[PDB]
Amino acid sequence: NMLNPKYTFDTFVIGSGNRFAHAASLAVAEAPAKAYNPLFIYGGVGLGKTHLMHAIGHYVIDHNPSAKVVYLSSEKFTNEFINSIRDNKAVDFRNRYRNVDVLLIDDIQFLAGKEQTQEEFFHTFNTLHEESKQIVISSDRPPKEIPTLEDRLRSRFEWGLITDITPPDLETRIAILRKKAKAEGLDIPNEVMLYIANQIDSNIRELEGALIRVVAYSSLINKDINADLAAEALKDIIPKVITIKEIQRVVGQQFNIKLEDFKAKKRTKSVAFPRQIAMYLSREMTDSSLPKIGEEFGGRDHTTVIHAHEKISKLLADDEQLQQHVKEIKEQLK
Amino acid sequence: NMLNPKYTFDTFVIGSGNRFAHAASLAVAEAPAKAYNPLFIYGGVGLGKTHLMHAIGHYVIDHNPSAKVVYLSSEKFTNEFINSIRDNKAVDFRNRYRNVDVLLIDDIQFLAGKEQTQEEFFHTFNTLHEESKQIVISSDRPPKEIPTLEDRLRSRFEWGLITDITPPDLETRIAILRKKAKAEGLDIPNEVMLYIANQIDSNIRELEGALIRVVAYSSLINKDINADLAAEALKDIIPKVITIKEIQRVVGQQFNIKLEDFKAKKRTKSVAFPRQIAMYLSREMTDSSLPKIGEEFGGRDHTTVIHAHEKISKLLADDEQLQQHVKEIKEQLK
Amino acid sequence: NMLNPKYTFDTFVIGSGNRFAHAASLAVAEAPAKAYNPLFIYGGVGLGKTHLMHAIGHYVIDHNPSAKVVYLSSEKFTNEFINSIRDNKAVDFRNRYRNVDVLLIDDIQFLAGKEQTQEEFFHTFNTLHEESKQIVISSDRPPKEIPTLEDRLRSRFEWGLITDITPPDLETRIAILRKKAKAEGLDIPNEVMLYIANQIDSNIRELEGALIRVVAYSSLINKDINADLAAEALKDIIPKVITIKEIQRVVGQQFNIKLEDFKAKKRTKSVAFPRQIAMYLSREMTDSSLPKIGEEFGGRDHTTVIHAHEKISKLLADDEQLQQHVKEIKEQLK
Ligand SMILES: Nc1ncnc2c1ncn2[C@@H]1O[C@H](COP(=O)(O)OP(=O)(O)OP(=O)(O)O)[C@@H](O)[C@H]1O
């Protein structure tokens, strides 16, 4: 029906970051409206929530064919709700959504900032929970930190079980890629697999994207996939952690002060100016503590750093030539 | 209809800079919504991304007349979306664009800075991907480079195939120019073809401008096209790499300091000043390493260059006569 | 409408400097949107660019009453665009300026420095060329040297034919004068036309103004126009080539020295200083080459010329009444 066939409990990879959410979803599928009537899922994007609840819907339909499992996104919920209001189809909207055996909702964050749709979902939740029906909600934030949410909805969300998804680690990244490769029907070396899994890790969508790009590049070049092939295909795609020494060398390449001049005790303006501009940049951009930064940068007290960067802010609040200088600094440092 | 009849697969010259993009585009045209749904071509200017998307549309419409194919630019998308919002026809906008079999969207970079429109296109993308429809996206720069793009949209862009287009080679430029001439229905000598293609490597949109200028000049002057006539026509149409030797000769033509004076070990202000002004000029307008430029400039240490160009920066941050002097220098060095 | 009855192809006098532009414009007029779609014409001031654009519009409207030709300036474009986006009526601005069969946009260089107006014109150009609508662009400088123009908009400017207008020569100046006089309906002796065309060669506009002044003064004096009356009428309206000999004579006059001792080998200050000032003036005023001026200076070496020029420049960089004397000398030479 309206469920992707690729998303299923059997095609889902279990890892440390999704074991709890997977187990809760499977328990809900095995015991609908009995174990966890409100089940709330939150996590990052590209982390497996839609896959998980498509798997729930598939499980429920397969084990029970009479069930009316409905899955949708909060965007479509609001669109249908408002169009029903505008076309006097409110009774039909209520009929279609209050009587489903299992309900599955994407990205309920979309409801934030919408008052009447939130009220209508509140009443739908109430009716479904009263009828001992099953409600499953996904989000990217826990219900505590969803803005513009009524306390009744916030308390309903926390009523049941709240599960979190975290970014996958290396073993499950390789396992996910292996599962995708085996489903597609391609043979690829472990070294290529590990190279991709190590080089790209922010979410999993980009993992599949990198894999399909490298296999397509190999197909075009008409050679089998190797580690060098993976490296050459995945070149325009490859975060740079900035260190205190890295920002020091950035400033000592742009304004190219010699390395030991910052540590010197010279009070002249020519020597001083790069010291305080780099001090302000490091203070605003790095997470290192103020005494620590003073320690590496000449072992200076925090008072000098404070005064220097404060006067730097004062001079950059009115003067624009150094403003374009500093925006270039922050453009070529990254 | 909305597709340029000239832009098609037959009129596209395959090279080493468009082979990967053309392969992905033709595979997508052969198997819409089955090979790589979110296809993402990006590249420079005048390179053929619009030609490629028009070719995809032509192929899929010819091989499947019933298929609903919509090509539009992201600017047109924003215009129509905002007009739908203001005219109270948003539902009609959703029906128009969410039900398309193949959606070709041009220059997605325009969505940078438009958060509501990015959300709308995010929802449209999700619908078109859930319904198993094809989405082809064009851009100037990779999705990780575009500013003010939500991580959801960036990850969905990077989910599918990503291809890039590079400027043509010289043989590719000659082949493109031959195809354009034979399409126009005229014969141009290979000497003229090589002359124009060797003169211009910017983009095909100016390659064809050069060819049309040559043909127009020949038609006016009532003489046959040859290399000399092409040179006559392209006098005012036709980048000069700036190197350290030519920078030194520019400064030795403006401030006319003799060649061996820079290499001299003198410490007088009159001798020294041209040395450091030229050194700062090169340092701000060269890609060569500081030790290399220092060795070239009399085999000097990098610290002396550092101090000299830094005092140059101080004297240019407050003095204006040398400011117009240096702007003249940079104007006439290029 | 917005076109000029006095600006048409019949009133245009074809010459060496506008034959190419006239032929390209006539081709565009005969076959709108099909021969040279992005036509770009640039030149000086008072040369015939707006005349040619109005002639193109006149021809198209005359041969095609169902043609929506719109002539406008860049200033009117930016005014209307900003007013529309301030009134929140941008949809009507777009509806007006993307449905024009021919767009005759003038003095496009005005768009320099207005980023969003440049973007709106960029989208307008894309929409108009994507639908096979003629585009004619006029400027005072070639598209390459229009500042703050993006590569995209410049490349669209360079896509088609680019023409240029050169200041007219004597025969076509006299032809323009004869045409203007015959259109006005007065008989003027050919000697008067030759006199005016000889003693005013700047553009059409001052030529037309000189003719108008001659006619008005002669009408006031109720005397038939002749060479002497034209001379008296143009007494108050009416550059010289600078000569090294003249410069030397002038400088020697101010600084109390004769003529024959310029090439003398005496190293006395009272003669060297005026000679250095004269050679500095020749260097910074004339295009004469350094070997040539050295030959005129009794075979002095280029190194000595360099040293004297640098010394004079540095000495003048610290004082102002030598600059005053130099300004007085330049005013005398003018
Ligand atoms: N074990 C796994 N954990 C997470 N994702 C997985 C796993 N195995 C496969 N995937 C893939 O991860 C991808 C992430 O897409 P998914 O639809 O789950 O995103 P999401 O974060 O839930 O977002 P949304 O709710 O907006 O759809 C899917 O294409 C899915 O096939």
Ligand SMILES: Nc1ncnc2c1ncn2[C@@H]1O[C@H](COP(=O)(O)OP(=O)(O)OP(=O)(O)O)[C@@H](O)[C@H]1O
């Ligand atoms: N490989 C090619 N063979 C033939 N013509 C080509 C090729 N690549 C580009 N062109 C031509 O270049 C011209 C301008 O390029 P085009 O508009 O197609 O690309 P683009 O600038 O990358 O696209 P977009 O405007 O969508 O960013 C077109 O007329 C097209 O025919």
Ligand SMILES: Nc1ncnc2c1ncn2[C@@H]1O[C@H](COP(=O)(O)OP(=O)(O)OP(=O)(O)O)[C@@H](O)[C@H]1O
């Ligand atoms: N070849 C020509 N023959 C006749 N008149 C000419 C010719 N060239 C220029 N002129 C005169 O130029 C006058 C005005 O100049 P025009 O506006 O055409 O030029 P422009 O200064 O380049 O234009 P713009 O208004 O775009 O800055 C017209 O009245 C026309 O008579």
Ligand SMILES: [Mg+2]
């Ligand atoms: Mg999804």
Ligand SMILES: [Mg+2]
């Ligand atoms: Mg594009």
Ligand SMILES: [Mg+2]
């Ligand atoms: Mg003009």
